[PDB]
């Protein structure tokens, strides 16, 4: 019946991949979620008045290449590129995450959203403009989020489904 989209949440350790996903699915903020737990969650959502089944993979584990990570990138239809706005290293790591998805999908136009997480925190080291300029250069949306307050959480995932729908 309804369309199903495979979403993948990527980004450096500690940016809030797990916190963002569990806020979307279960409507609470996790303070300390085990960094090895990689699991997928299913949720029906209405976006722009059309229902879709989202199947969301929250990535975890070691800094390693694997043919299996290549696989869930290959099956993934859209990617959240998550950094934390208080962690410049996580922002500098976005290039790596995009390159490895671009490697396995052989496209610079795969549906993606840049997510600047932890927007509730005062000591920002990455400004709106620097993230907007990065997303513009990539040809993707930028969304500021807080897993803690829920600000922008739905918008990040919904915006990615909007990007997958335009793609064909």
Ligand X SMILES: Nc1nc2c(ncn2[C@@H]2O[C@H](COP(=O)(O)OP(=O)(O)O)[C@@H](O)[C@H]2O)c(=O)[nH]1
Ligand Y SMILES: *CCC(=O)N1CCN2c3ncnc4cc(-c5c(C)ccc6n[nH]cc56)c(Cl)c(c34)OCC[C@H]2C1
Task: Find the length of the chain.
Answer: 168
Which 70-99 positions form the footprint of ligand X (CB under 6 A)?
none
Contact 15, 81 (CB under 8 A): no
Would you give the binding string for ligand Y spanning residues 57-76, x where CB under 6 A is met?
Answer: --xxxxx-xx--xx--x---
Residue 163: CA count within 13 A, CB half-sphere: 23
Q: Which of 75, 90, 65, 83 is nearest to 7 (CA)?
A: 75
Residues 134, 138: Cα–Cα separation, whole Å? 6
Minimum separation from the CB atom of position 2 to Mg ion (A): 28
Please choose which of ligand X, Mg ion, ligand Y, none residue 19 contacts, taking the beta carbon within 5 to 8 angstroms, the exact cut-off set by kind.
Answer: ligand X
Residues 142, 75: Cα–Cα separation, whole Å? 23
Dihedral, CA of residue 84, residue 88, residue 92 and residue 97, to nearest 10: -20
Would you give the end-to-end CA distance of the chain in angstroms? Answer: 18
Rounded to an integer, what is the distance from CA 139 to the centroid of its chain? Answer: 15
Minimum separation from the CB atom of position 109 to ligand X (A): 25
Which 111-150 positions form the footprint of ligand X (CB under 6 A)?
117-118, 120-121, 146-148
Please choose which of Mg ion, ligand X, ligand Y, none residue 120 contacts, taking the beta carbon within 5 to 8 angstroms, the exact cut-off set by kind.
Answer: ligand X
Which 21-50 positions form the footprint of Mg ion (CB under 5 A)?
none
Minimum separation from the CB atom of position 127 to Mg ion (A): 26
Asked if 59 interacts with Mg ion (CB under 5 A), we say no
Which residues of the shown chain bind Mg ion in the complex (CB under 5 A)?
A: 17-18, 60
Which residues of the shown chain bind ligand Y in the complex (CB under 6 A)?
A: 10, 12-13, 17, 35, 59-63, 65-66, 69-70, 73, 97, 100-101, 104
Which residues of the shown chain bind ligand X in the complex (CB under 6 A)?
A: 11, 13-19, 30-33, 35, 117-118, 120-121, 146-148
């Amino acid at each position: 019946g309804m369309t199903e989209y495979k979403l993948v949440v990527v980004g450096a350790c500690g940016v809030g991949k797990s916190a963002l996903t569990i806020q979307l699915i279960q409507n609470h903020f996790v303070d300390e979620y085990d960094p090895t737990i990689e699991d997928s969650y299913r949720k029906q959502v209405v976006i722009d008045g059309e229902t879709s089944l989202l199947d969301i993979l929250d990535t975890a584990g070691q800094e390693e290449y694997s043919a299996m990570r290549d696989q869930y990138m290959r099956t993934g239809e859209g990617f959240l590129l998550v950094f934390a706005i208080n962690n410049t290293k996580s922002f500098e790591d976005i290039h790596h995450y995009r390159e490895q998805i671009k490697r396995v999908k052989d496209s610079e136009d795969v549906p993606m959203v840049l997510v600047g997480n932890k927007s509730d925190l005062p000591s920002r080291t990455v400004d709106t403009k620097q993230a907007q300029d990065l997303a513009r250069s990539y040809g993707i949306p930028f969304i500021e989020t807080s897993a803690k307050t829920r600000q922008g959480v739905d918008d990040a995932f919904y915006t990615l489904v909007r990007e997958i729908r335009k793609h064909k």
